[PDB]
Each structure stands twice: as C-alpha cells, then as structure tokens.
Design an enzyme around this catalytic site. Structure first.
Site, PDB file in Angstrom:
ATOM      1  N   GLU A   1       0.824  -1.203   0.000  1.00  0.00           N
ATOM      2  CA  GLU A   1       0.000   0.000   0.000  1.00  0.00           C
ATOM      3  C   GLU A   1       0.861   1.257   0.000  1.00  0.00           C
ATOM      4  O   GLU A   1       0.904   1.988   0.999  1.00  0.00           O
ATOM      5  CB  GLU A   1      -0.949  -0.013   1.195  1.00  0.00           C
ATOM      6  CG  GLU A   1      -2.005  -1.086   1.076  1.00  0.00           C
ATOM      7  CD  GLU A   1      -2.572  -1.486   2.410  1.00  0.00           C
ATOM      8  OE1 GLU A   1      -2.084  -0.968   3.436  1.00  0.00           O
ATOM      9  OE2 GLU A   1      -3.500  -2.321   2.427  1.00  0.00           O
TER      10      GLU A   1
ATOM     11  N   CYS B   1      -9.210  -8.936   4.294  1.00  0.00           N
ATOM     12  CA  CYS B   1      -9.624  -9.253   5.657  1.00  0.00           C
ATOM     13  C   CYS B   1     -10.784  -8.353   6.054  1.00  0.00           C
ATOM     14  O   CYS B   1     -10.946  -7.256   5.515  1.00  0.00           O
ATOM     15  CB  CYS B   1      -8.472  -9.088   6.658  1.00  0.00           C
ATOM     16  SG  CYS B   1      -8.374  -7.451   7.417  1.00  0.00           S
TER      17      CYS B   1
ATOM     18  N   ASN C   1     -13.814 -11.026  -8.292  1.00  0.00           N
ATOM     19  CA  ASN C   1     -12.451 -10.934  -8.807  1.00  0.00           C
ATOM     20  C   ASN C   1     -12.217 -11.931  -9.932  1.00  0.00           C
ATOM     21  O   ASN C   1     -11.615 -11.591 -10.958  1.00  0.00           O
ATOM     22  CB  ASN C   1     -11.446 -11.161  -7.677  1.00  0.00           C
ATOM     23  CG  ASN C   1     -11.249  -9.932  -6.815  1.00  0.00           C
ATOM     24  OD1 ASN C   1     -10.318  -9.154  -7.023  1.00  0.00           O
ATOM     25  ND2 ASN C   1     -12.125  -9.753  -5.836  1.00  0.00           N
TER      26      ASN C   1
HETATM   27  C1  LIG Z   1      -6.035   2.055   9.973  1.00  0.00           C
HETATM   28  C2  LIG Z   1      -5.892   2.144   8.460  1.00  0.00           C
HETATM   29  C3  LIG Z   1      -5.884   3.641   8.171  1.00  0.00           C
HETATM   30  C4  LIG Z   1      -7.146   1.533   7.835  1.00  0.00           C
HETATM   31  C5  LIG Z   1      -7.163   1.860   6.338  1.00  0.00           C
HETATM   32  C6  LIG Z   1      -6.053   1.301   5.423  1.00  0.00           C
HETATM   33  S1  LIG Z   1      -6.030  -0.519   5.166  1.00  0.00           S
HETATM   34  O1  LIG Z   1      -5.169  -0.833   3.952  1.00  0.00           O
HETATM   35  O2  LIG Z   1      -7.465  -0.923   4.843  1.00  0.00           O
HETATM   36  C7  LIG Z   1      -5.517  -1.607   6.553  1.00  0.00           C
HETATM   37  C8  LIG Z   1      -5.538  -3.053   5.990  1.00  0.00           C
HETATM   38  N1  LIG Z   1      -4.527  -3.236   4.925  1.00  0.00           N
HETATM   39  C9  LIG Z   1      -3.160  -2.993   5.428  1.00  0.00           C
HETATM   40  C10 LIG Z   1      -2.833  -3.964   6.545  1.00  0.00           C
HETATM   41  O3  LIG Z   1      -1.497  -3.732   7.031  1.00  0.00           O
HETATM   42  C11 LIG Z   1      -3.826  -3.764   7.661  1.00  0.00           C
HETATM   43  O4  LIG Z   1      -3.551  -4.691   8.718  1.00  0.00           O
HETATM   44  C12 LIG Z   1      -5.216  -4.033   7.102  1.00  0.00           C
HETATM   45  O5  LIG Z   1      -6.218  -3.865   8.109  1.00  0.00           O
END
Ligand SMILES: CC(C)CCCS(=O)(=O)C[C@H]1NC[C@@H](O)[C@H](O)[C@H]1O
Ligand SMILES: *[C@@H]1O[C@H](CO)[C@@H](O[C@@H]2O[C@H](CO)[C@@H](O)[C@H](O)[C@H]2NC(C)=O)[C@H](O)[C@H]1NC(C)=O
Ligand SMILES: *[C@@H]1O[C@H](CO[C@@H]2O[C@@H](C)[C@@H](O)[C@@H](O)[C@@H]2O)[C@@H](O)[C@H](O)[C@H]1NC(C)=O
EC number: 3.2.1.45
Length: 492
Positions: free
Chosen positions: A235, A340, A365
């Site tokens: 990300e 998730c 998907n």
């Molecule tokens: C607290 C954040 C601002 C929420 C929004 C971004 S996110 O990408 O939706 C988080 C998810 N993807 C990245 C993983 O590391 C993480 O554990 C998973 O919950």
C-alpha cells in the site's frame, strides 16, 4: 473423515471447534465416473463442505434457472489461493500444543484440508507485529553489512513456512511484501507517518533499498525458502497520508515507476533471484487504472513488472477498476494480494455474513480476470490481535491460547470452496445464466479437463438450479438460501 464440531457464539452461524486431538478434515479426493458429479455444500444452518454425489442426466424437465457451461470461452489461468503468515499469525499458531499446530496447518495446506498454495510473507514488521523493527536498523549502513533476520523470522515464520510446505500436496508459492524501510532511508525518519525514500530514484538511498530486497531473498534462500514474487511496496499510497499509524513507505505512482525502472528492477535482474516476479500497486483497486497507466507506459519500468497486486478494501465497482485495467493491459496479470474483515466488533465468531463477503468478492475478482486471491492474517486471537497499533480485524481461524483450541470461521470454508477445488493452472470458462438471478456463479476448468463450478446464494430463498455441460448433460440441484456450493465432474 471427521466432521465439524459446532459451537455458537451468538452470531448468524457456528464455528468449528478444533484442538490438539480433534479437527474436521477431508478424505483424499476421488475420481467419480463420467455422468456423476460431486457436490460440496456449506450452509448457514451448520453444514460445512459436506460431500455428496449425483447423476448428470441426458435431458432436463423443469421451469427453473439454468446455467450452461461454455468451455470454449476461455479466460485467465489461476495462480492460487492462500493467506499471510504475519508475526501475529505465527504467534497464535505456535501458542498451541504441537499436535494442535499441525491440525491447524493441515487445515489450510493439506489435501485433508483446503489446499492453500500461496503464503504472503511480510518483510520485517507490520501492524500485525508486537514491536517495530526492520532488517537493518543500525543507521548509515548503506551496503547493508548488518542486515539480519530477527527471531520473528528465524524462530516463528520460517519454521511454520517449512512445516506448511511439508504438509502441502501442491507446490506453495511464497509472496513477499515490505511495509517500511529502515528509518534512516526515509524523509521523516520514522517507521510510520507521511514519508518516502530520501533523495531521488538512482541515488545511494534508492540503491540501498533495492538491495534490501536482495538481502531479504538471500536470507530466506539460506533457510532454503525460494520466493515466487515480491511486491514493490505494501500500500504505497498509505505512506503519502499525514499521520499514518502503521509501518508504511510513501510512493506516488510516478515514484514507484521510477524506483522500478532505475533501481528495483535492474537490481533484482542483476541478482541470483532474477526469476522472482515483481508485482506493482499492492494497494486498493481504487487506484486503478490510473496507477497502471503511470507505471506500465514507461517501457523501462514495464519491462520489470510481471503483474498488478490488488487489495480488496475500499471496494464497497470492479468493471471500472479491474476490468478497465485488463482492457488497457491484457498481458499483465491481476492478483488479489490481501483481504480481511465500523460499529461491529473486531472478531465475530461464527459470522456467516463475513463468510459470504469472502466468497462473493472471490467470485467478483474471478469474473474480472484476477488470477489469485490472498487472505490477510492466517490466524488471530479472539480480540483480533496481536496488533501493536490498534487495527484489530477478523481471521478465518481464531486461536484460544488458554484452552489449546482454535475455531474455524465460516470465512475459512467460503475460501476453501475455492482454494481446495481450483488448483494452480485452472482456467476460467464461460457460464451463461438463462435468466436474471440472485446467485453468484463462476465456472472454471481444471488442467486435467474436469469442470468446477462455485455457486453462492446470498439470498434467503431456495433457488432450484440446473447446470448444463454440453459434453455430458444436465445437473439437477437446489441452491438453498444462504449457502455456497462447489460442483465438480469429469467431462469425459
Ligand atoms: C487504519 C488504516 C488507516 C485503515 C485503512 C487502510 S487498510 O489498507 O485498509 C488496513 C488493511 N490493509 C493494510 C494492513 O497492514 C492492515 O492490517 C489491514 O487492516
Ligand atoms: C477436543 O475436542 C474433542 C472433540 O469434541 C473432544 O472430545 C469430545 O469430548 C467429549 C467429552 O466432554 C465427548 O463427549 C465427545 O464424544 C468427544 N468427541 C469425540 C471423542 O469425538 C475433547 O474432549 C476436546 N479436548 C478437551 C481437552 O476437551
Ligand atoms: C429429452 O426430451 C425431448 C422431448 O421429449 C418429448 O417430449 C416430452 C414432453 C415427452 O413427451 C417425451 O416423452 C417426448 O419424447 C426429446 O425429444 C429428447 O430427445 C430428449 N433428449 C435426450 C438427450 O434424450
């Protein structure tokens, strides 16, 4: 061989209890003759991938909905399915007695289980760790002489990766993704927050970060683990957000385009791991197709990019994101690398809704050229941790350390309805609906020619159903309300 031991925790469905001496499992798969199909059924009422068989008939008499297999209409080939062995997943699996650990690992990776074949390995810490760390924390080490794997890799992750490979009938593909670089290589000198790499692509900072990838693959090759692919950054848009809490590393699409062209691409090419694939984005499909235009238009960057990795958050249209990206770049595979599951509790033991969320998104998907789907944490505790920030989420397997017991969520069986029956190499084929319906269906063809069809019913009404295979015949069945089915049959 052994059926699910159900327990309710107050939600819409049950979990399956497992411990050191009991866990539900499958027998080794069999080959039913032509004219016969196999059906696996999971329902909100409590059925868990229950196997049954029936005939494929010569003609059909009915007034109901009909799905027709169209094997001559062939699309993308599947890489596989799996999850991520984060620090949290490893800590929760290893907190069990060794006999229970193996029944959890056999649940995911064995043919007695649902046959995963992809494991996502974070490079150093992420938010699902119990401490911040990287592989090169001592500063001013630009040649990375003090690069080392901590106990998180040598004691927890790698041993569990080994044992999962031993239990897997299918070849497992490992996929690496970095969250943050050493802080002395970042603009803001922090593991989190808004910040990118210091300097510009091509300098000492970007060269040092690119070989961090090689030194990581080196360290795992020494532990006799080879990687199928790595992503440029987990990300990378998160590292552009002011005050981001987790470990991150900022990349604008142009920054990631240049870092691949000048640094990461050539460095991985000039190395012993030149065959490792490089996936881009590894972020929300929201950023598509724009991120694909910025990166893949530059041939010096595109020459190194094997695919595009997608995350499934921030989805709540696919044709405008996945479909349009495929239309612009049909030879660059799309891959779901992380998934998730605001007013709701973090863990919802027995939630059939979250199971449907998994299977529906997998079907979507697949219908839009994605070649694989990866889950997030392999296992978590009943509070959704451990997580050093706060970000507690759900996981298909929930571990109870105090009772040497882990629960298999409905999420587990919804993914298993795909991972167990769609091996690597399967190709998605056409499946025509005779009339509008409430079902989600996807049809694929094994490498050995046999058919597989997943049918999920997110409605509450029973839907009578007929599947036609022009080479075989008509499959009479019923898709109950709130159920998911996987059908398999030989075509000759
Ligand atoms: C607290 C954040 C601002 C929420 C929004 C971004 S996110 O990408 O939706 C988080 C998810 N993807 C990245 C993983 O590391 C993480 O554990 C998973 O919950
Ligand atoms: C681990 O799970 C198994 C499966 O439920 C438990 O075995 C059951 O134990 C109860 C006793 O309370 C019996 O009535 C059941 O018939 C058993 N199921 C079997 C044998 O399949 C086992 O007790 C659990 N472990 C612990 C420590 O409780
Ligand atoms: C399937 O059915 C077709 C129609 O059968 C005819 O019409 C029905 C309403 C009955 O009256 C039946 O007795 C009639 O023969 C058949 O023509 C067709 O051949 C059948 N298909 C196969 C593959 O056997």
């Amino acid at each position: 061989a052994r059926p699910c031991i159900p327990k309710s925790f107050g939600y819409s469905s049950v979990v399956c209890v497992c411990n050191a001496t009991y866990c539900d499992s499958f027998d080794p798969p069999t080959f039913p003759a032509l004219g016969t199909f196999s059906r696996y059924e999971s329902t909100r009422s409590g059925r868990r991938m229950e196997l049954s068989m029936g005939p494929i008939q010569a003609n059909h008499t009915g007034t109901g909905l009909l799905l027709t297999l169209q094997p001559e209409q062939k699309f993308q080939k599947v890489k596989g399915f799996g999850g991520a062995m984060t620090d949290a997943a490893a800590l929760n699996i290893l907190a069990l007695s060794p006999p229970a650990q193996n029944l959890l690992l056999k649940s995911y990776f064995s043919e007695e289980g649902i046959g995963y074949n992809i494991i996502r390995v974070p490079m150093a810490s992420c938010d699902f760790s119990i401490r911040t760390y990287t592989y090169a924390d001592t500063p001013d080490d630009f040649q990375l002489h003090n690069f080392s794997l901590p106990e998180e890799d040598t004691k927890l992750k790698i041993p569990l990766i080994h044992r999962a490979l031993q239990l897997a009938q299918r070849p497992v593909s490992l996929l690496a993704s970095p969250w943050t670089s050493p802080t002395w290589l970042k603009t803001n000198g922090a593991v989190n927050g808004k910040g990118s790499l210091k300097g510009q692509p091509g300098d000492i900072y970007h060269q040092t970060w690119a070989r961090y990838f090689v030194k990581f693959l080196d360290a795992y090759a020494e532990h006799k683990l080879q990687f199928w692919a790595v992503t440029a950054e987990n990300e990378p848009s998160a590292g552009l957000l002011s005050g981001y809490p987790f470990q991150c590393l900022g990349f604008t699409p142009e920054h990631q385009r240049d870092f691949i062209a000048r640094d990461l691409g050539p460095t991985l090419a000039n190395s012993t791991h030149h065959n490792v694939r490089l996936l881009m984005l590894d972020d929300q499909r929201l950023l598509l197709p724009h991120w694909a235009k910025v990166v893949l238009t530059d041939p010096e960057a595109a020459k190194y990019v094997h695919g595009i990795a997608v995350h499934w958050y921030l989805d709540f249209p696919a044709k405008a994101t996945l479909g349009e990206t495929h239309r612009l770049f049909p030879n660059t595979m799309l891959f779901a690398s992380e998934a998730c599951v605001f007013w709701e509790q973090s863990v919802r033991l027995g939630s059939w809704d979250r199971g449907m969320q998994y299977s529906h998104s997998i079907i979507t998907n697949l219908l839009y050229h994605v070649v694989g789907w990866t889950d997030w944490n392999l296992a978590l505790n009943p509070e959704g941790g451990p997580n050093w920030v706060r970000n507690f989420v759900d996981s298909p397997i929930i571990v109870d350390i105090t009772k040497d017991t882990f629960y298999k969520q409905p999420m587990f069986y919804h993914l298993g309805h795909f991972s167990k029956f769609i091996p690597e190499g399967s190709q998605r084929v056409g499946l025509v609906a005779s009339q509008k319906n409430d079902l989600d269906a996807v049809a694929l063809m094994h490498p050995d020619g046999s058919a597989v069809v997943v049918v999920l019913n997110r409605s509450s009404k029973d839907v009578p159903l007929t599947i036609k295979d022009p080479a075989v015949g008509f499959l009479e069945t019923i898709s109950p309300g709130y159920s998911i089915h996987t059908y398999l049959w030989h075509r000759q």
